[PDB]
């Protein structure tokens, strides 16, 4: 499945009037000035998919997500987000070409959900989501600061991530099967992202995987190793991205959300990363919030975010139909 | 710089509007026909809207983009 | 005082042959591709000023700062950094125009310090530095990721910063408030300049008895309605942290400021606004800025080009000042 | 936007194909403007990283020279 659009009403900085945010089946770049409300779109997605952590969505508490009014608009009565999924590939266990999930929260924190019009419970929404293999907070969602995480992540945490992606006696064989694949993807993808360099994944206890962690051995531009903890922001970002993409190449998630994952990339690396996103766009949907000309110029469609007296709004542009 | 490209684009919007009195089509605002140039023009308009210099109008998703100076 | 140049030998990614890095009295941009060793220059500065945290300089142990060898080079026997300060203003309690500090670390983890050629204790070095308003732990040094510190830190830690800028610390309350009110105005003034249409201010939790409370930041990016600095996005946080730094430097200019990609989350318009703020400020303070953004380097007085050649960092100094005259 | 870097390597492999000597930086920066003189510089640094060229400078702020490879 893939996101066709989002509709916000009273959600954070978007004010009261319904805001329709459409997405390319492939690569969409969300752009606009600092403080425009770009990251709030990412929070909107965390919100509809069941997010429970106020902090995770940059809010003091859940009710804080309700638009508080502005110069021209009064405090919203509630915050609502509706997400429309194209279900032609039937990823969802629903025989419908369009699955719609909608969540609304009131000033008292109470949330209400709906699935294709019929109201559901949070648990029901999560079950349907996992069923379509959509993780509201999986590795596929890279918000600001999540890169310093794929790096600080312990070797055990990292292998646990793969356990999950493999699908849990002969279980070692399955694990190894998916590990050998992702490891290869990682080496190929890293070489491409870092010309003249190479990298690979290594199991601490290759004979008994589950007893050890999963480490990363990187040789950036040379043939000399270098602890990832010792790299600079730029190399750390590339490395985390190589890992994320190495996973998607093996098991394409319905969609990936990236929030300024290019903040520390030089222009040539923004370009390589952008090309990798396009090539990957064929199997998964990519929603990328960026401030870089290079990343933006490479997207299929662009969602422009701007403000108006404290109120966010968007304008959608298709680079294809713009030709 | 970028501080200039935005001010020039704004003047271009003002001049056209000062004569037509009707919202400017985004298309007649983009010089060269290349993803890089189209997006940069788009971006600058977004910046001008934040600045309360212009107002961007769009009726439907991916529909025609029109601009009106403030 | 200001940094005239840095000399690295066997330090991190800079190999065995001595490397000299010149700095403008004003605004210097350090540029180059990812993985070139730009950040390591910041570490070299942190190192010579007595930095003790290996972790802060991205090393397991202080000894790991020693060049470990490359394609065409064997491992270094030790790492040494020398920093040359112009002391014409006598910021250093030494009657010399040039103050040189040098530190060398051996494989065993021991460090030897030198103050103008004469062996010195780390303590002697730290004291001489304190006297000149310089410190490895100073707010004027903003490494990658530190930017937000002037946001995520506690109101108590924040006030403590201002305590430092005010004086030795009764009659103290008088000096503090004097310092607090000026920086507060600078903050509001500068934040407005950086976030047009917005405003922000500093607030003491306890006006009557400042020292029994902390110092908070109250930002209104929109301009009317307040906003928790934690609800902000990456760029907003960066702007808030930067306005605070510059608010302090406008009141009491520090010898130098070291910024490592503080513009990572700023949009082009804000990179310009920050670059302009840096140019104007570099008249009273030295600014050394690592950046990947074109708008930022284009506004520099001088540029330090960092590149890697065979796994070894290399530098090239270019002065736009003496380059235009050609 | 890596074409600008490749076209720069061209004029370097050309002014050297003739002169056979190290190219002066000055003769590589088109417009006498800060933004351009800085980009030319950045691109050369990028080139050195790739292994395309080699930058030469005998002293701090001294004369820069470029030798292709």
Q: What is the DSSP string of D31-42?
A: SS-HHHHHHHHH
CA C122 centroid distance within chain: 20
Q: Is B39 on the interface with C (CB under 8 A)?
A: no
Distance CA A194, CA A191 (A): 5
Residue D66 contacts residue D51 (beta carbons within 8 Å): no
Which distant-in-sequence residues (6+ apart) come within 8 Å of C111 by Cβ? C62, C103, C104, C105, C122
Containing C318, the helix (H) or strand (E) segment is strand C313-319
Q: Exposure pattern of C39-69 as b/e (b: 16+ CB <10 Å)?
A: bbbbbbbbbbbbbeebebbbbeebbbbbbbe
Residue A234 contacts residue A174 (beta carbons within 8 Å): no
Residue A308 contacts residue B49 (beta carbons within 8 Å): yes
CA B19 centroid distance within chain: 16
Q: Is A221 on the interface with D (CB under 8 A)?
A: yes
Per the DSSP assignment, residues forming a β-bridge with A29 are: A288, A302
Using the Cα atoms of residue C277, residue C278, residue C280 and residue C285 in order, give the sign of their dihedral: positive
Cβ within 8 Å, pair D49-A294: no
Structure determination method: X-ray
Residue A21 neighbours by CB distance under 10 Å: 23
Phi, psi dihedral angles at A79 (to 5 degrees): -115, 130
Residue B57 contacts residue B23 (beta carbons within 8 Å): yes
Resolution to 1 decimal place, in Å: 2.3
Cβ within 8 Å, pair A268-D51: no
HSE at residue C176, side-chain half, CA atoms within 13 A, is 22
Cβ within 8 Å, pair C298-B51: no
Residue B31 neighbours by CB distance under 10 Å: 11
C 3-62: CB under 8 A from D: 5, 20-22, 31-33, 36
Distance CA C65, CA C10 (A): 8
- Alpha-carbon distance values, C248 to A129, A243, C140, C229, C326 (Å): 50, 41, 9, 19, 38
The tokens for C220 are 């209104």
Q: Is B58 on the interface with A (CB under 8 A)?
A: yes
Q: Where does A1-322 sit in CATH, by number?
A: 3.40.50.300
Scanning every residue of chain C, which has its alpha carbon at the shortest distance from the alpha carbon of B52?
C197
HSE at residue A176, side-chain half, CA atoms within 13 A, is 10
Per the DSSP assignment, residues forming a β-bridge with B57 are: B66
Residue A112 contacts residue A104 (beta carbons within 8 Å): yes
Closest CA of chain A from B43, distance in Å:
6
Residue D35 contacts residue C300 (beta carbons within 8 Å): no
> In which residue are the tokens 């356990």 written?
A163
Q: Is B46 on the interface with C (CB under 8 A)?
A: no
Cβ within 8 Å, pair D55-C316: yes
SS (H, E, C) chain B: CHHHHHHHHHHHHHHHHHHHCCCEEHHHHCCCCCHHHHHHHHHHHHHHHHCCCEEEECCCCCCCCEEEEC
Residue A6 contacts residue A84 (beta carbons within 8 Å): yes
Distance CA C35, CA C290 (A): 13
**Burial (CB count within 10 angstroms: exposed 0-12, middle 13-18, buried 19+), residue B28:** exposed
Q: Is A195 on the interface with D (CB under 8 A)?
A: yes
Using the Cα atoms of residue C23, residue C24, residue C28 and residue C33 in order, give the sign of their dihedral: negative
CA angle C306, C309, C313 (to 5 degrees): 45
Cβ within 8 Å, pair B46-A323: no
Distance CA C25, CA C86 (A): 9
Q: Is D61 on the interface with C (CB under 8 A)?
A: yes
| Residue-range domains of chain B with CATH | 1-70 (1.10.10.580)
Which distant-in-sequence residues (6+ apart) come within 8 Å of D17 by Cβ? none
SS (H, E, C) A176-233: HHHHHHHHHHHHHHHHHHCCCCEEEEEECCCCCHHHCCEEEEEECCCCCCCCHHHCCH
Q: Residue ranges of the domains in chain A? A: 1-322
The tokens for D1 are 């936007």
The tokens for C277 are 């703020």
Distance CA C73, CA A157 (A): 36
End-to-end CA distance of chain D: 22
Q: Smallest Cβ distance to B50: which of A20, A307, A317?
A: A307
* CATH class (in words) of the domain with range C1-326: alpha beta
Residue A241: closest CA among A226, A217, A258: A258
Phi, psi dihedral angles at C193 (to 5 degrees): -65, -45
Distance CA C269, CA C277 (A): 12
SS (H, E, C) chain A: CEEEEEEEECEHHHCCCCEEEECCCCEEEEECCCCCCHHHHHHHHHHHCCCCCCHHHCCCCHHHHECCCCCCCCCCCCEEEEEEEECCCCCCCCCCCEEEEEEEECCCCCEEEEECCEEECHHHHHHHHHHCCCCCCCCCEECCCCHHHHHHCCHHHHHHHHHHHHCCCCHHHHHHHHHHHHHHHHHHHHHHHCCCCEEEEEECCCCCHHHCCEEEEEECCCCCCCCHHHCCHHHHHHHHHHHHHHHHHHCCCCEEEEECCCCCCCHHHHHHHHHHHHHHHCCCEEEEECCCHHHHCCCCEEEEEECCCCCCEEEEEECCCCC
Neighbours of chain C (3+ CB pairs under 8 A): A, B, D
Q: What 3-state DSSP class applies to C149? A: helix
Contacts of B61 in chain A (CB under 8 A): 5, 20, 22, 316
Q: Is D35 on the interface with C (CB under 8 A)?
A: yes
Residue D65 neighbours by CB distance under 10 Å: 16
Cβ within 8 Å, pair C59-A144: no
Distance CA C206, CA C218 (A): 15
Q: Smallest Cβ distance to B50: which of A36, A298, A301?
A: A36
The tokens for C138 are 């100073």
> In which residue are the tokens 């003496």 written?
C322
Distance CA A266, CA C297 (A): 13
Residue C31 contacts residue C66 (beta carbons within 8 Å): no
Contacts of B30 in chain A (CB under 8 A): 322
Residue A30 contacts residue A41 (beta carbons within 8 Å): yes
Distance CA A263, CA A232 (A): 12
Scanning every residue of chain A, which has its alpha carbon at the shortest distance from the alpha carbon of C239?
A34
Which distant-in-sequence residues (6+ apart) come within 8 Å of C202 by Cβ? C180, C183, C184, C187, C188, C215, C216, C217, C218
Neighbours of chain A (3+ CB pairs under 8 A): B, C, D
Cβ within 8 Å, pair C264-A263: yes
Q: What is the largest CA-CA distance in chain A?
A: 65
User: Using alpha carbons only, how large is chain C's radius of gyration in Å?
Assistant: 20
Q: Is D11 on the interface with A (CB under 8 A)?
A: no
Which distant-in-sequence residues (6+ apart) come within 8 Å of A214 by Cβ? A155, A156, A158, A159, A161, A162, A179, A201, A202, A203, A204
**Burial (CB count within 10 angstroms: exposed 0-12, middle 13-18, buried 19+), residue D18:** exposed
The tokens for A238 are 């590339």
Residue A275 neighbours by CB distance under 10 Å: 13
Residue C92 neighbours by CB distance under 10 Å: 23
Q: What 3-state DSSP class applies to C302? A: strand
Distance CA C217, CA C151 (A): 8
Scanning every residue of chain C, which has its alpha carbon at the shortest distance from the alpha carbon of D61?
C317
Q: Smallest Cβ distance to C316: which of D38, D39, D57?
A: D57
A 154-183: CB under 8 A from C: none
* Binding site, annotated residues of C for ATP: 33-40
Distance CA B69, CA B59 (A): 18
């Amino acid at each position: 499945p893939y996101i066709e659009k989002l509709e916000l009403k009273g959600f954070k900085s978007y004010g009261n009037k319904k805001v329709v945010i459409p997405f390319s089946k492939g690569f969409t770049a969300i752009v606009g000035a600092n403080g425009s409300g770009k990251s709030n779109i990412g929070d909107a997605i965390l919100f509809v998919l069941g997010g429970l952590s106020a902090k995770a969505m940059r809010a003091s508490r859940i009710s804080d997500l309700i638009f508080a009014g502005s110069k021209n608009e009064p405090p919203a009565k509630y915050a609502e987000v509706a997400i429309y999924f194209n279900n032609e590939d039937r990823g969802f266990p629903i025989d419908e070409d369009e699955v719609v999930i909608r969540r609304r929260v009131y000033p008292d924190g109470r949330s209400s959900y709906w699935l294709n019009g019929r109201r559901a419970t949070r648990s029901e929404i999560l079950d349907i989501l996992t069923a379509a293999m959509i993780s509201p907070d999986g590795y596929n969602i890279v918000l600001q600061g999540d890169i310093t995480k794929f790096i600080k992540m312990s070797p055990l945490e990292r292998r646990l991530l793969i356990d999950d992606i493999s699908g849990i006696k002969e279980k070692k064989n399955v694990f190894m099967r998916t590990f050998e694949a992702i490891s290869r993807n990682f080496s190929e993808i890293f070489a491409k992202l870092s010309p003249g360099g190479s990298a690979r994944l290594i199991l601490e206890n290759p004979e008994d995987p589950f007893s050890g962690g999963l480490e990363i051995e990187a040789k950036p531009a040379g043939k000399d190793v270098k602890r990832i903890e010792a790299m600079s922001g730029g190399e750390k970002a590339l490395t985390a991205l190589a890992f994320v993409f190495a996973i998607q190449k093996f098991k394409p998630a319905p969609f990936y959300l990236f929030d300024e994952i290019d903040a520390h990339l030089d222009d040539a690396n923004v370009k390589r990363v952008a090309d990798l996103i396009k090539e990957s766009s064929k199997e998964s949907q990519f929603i990328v919030i960026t401030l870089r000309d290079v990343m933006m110029a490479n997207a299929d469609k662009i969602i422009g975010v701007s403000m108006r007296d404290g109120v966010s709004k968007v304008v959608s542009l298709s680079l294809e139909k713009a030709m | 710089d970028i501080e200039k490209y935005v001010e020039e684009l704004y003047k271009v919007v003002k001049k056209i509007y000062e004569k037509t009195g009707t919202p400017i089509k985004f298309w007649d605002l983009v010089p060269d026909v290349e993803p890089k140039i189209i997006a940069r023009t788009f971006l600058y308009l977004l910046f001008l809207e934040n600045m309360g210099r212009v107002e961007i109008i769009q009726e439907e998703p991916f529909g025609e983009i029109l601009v009106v100076p403030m």
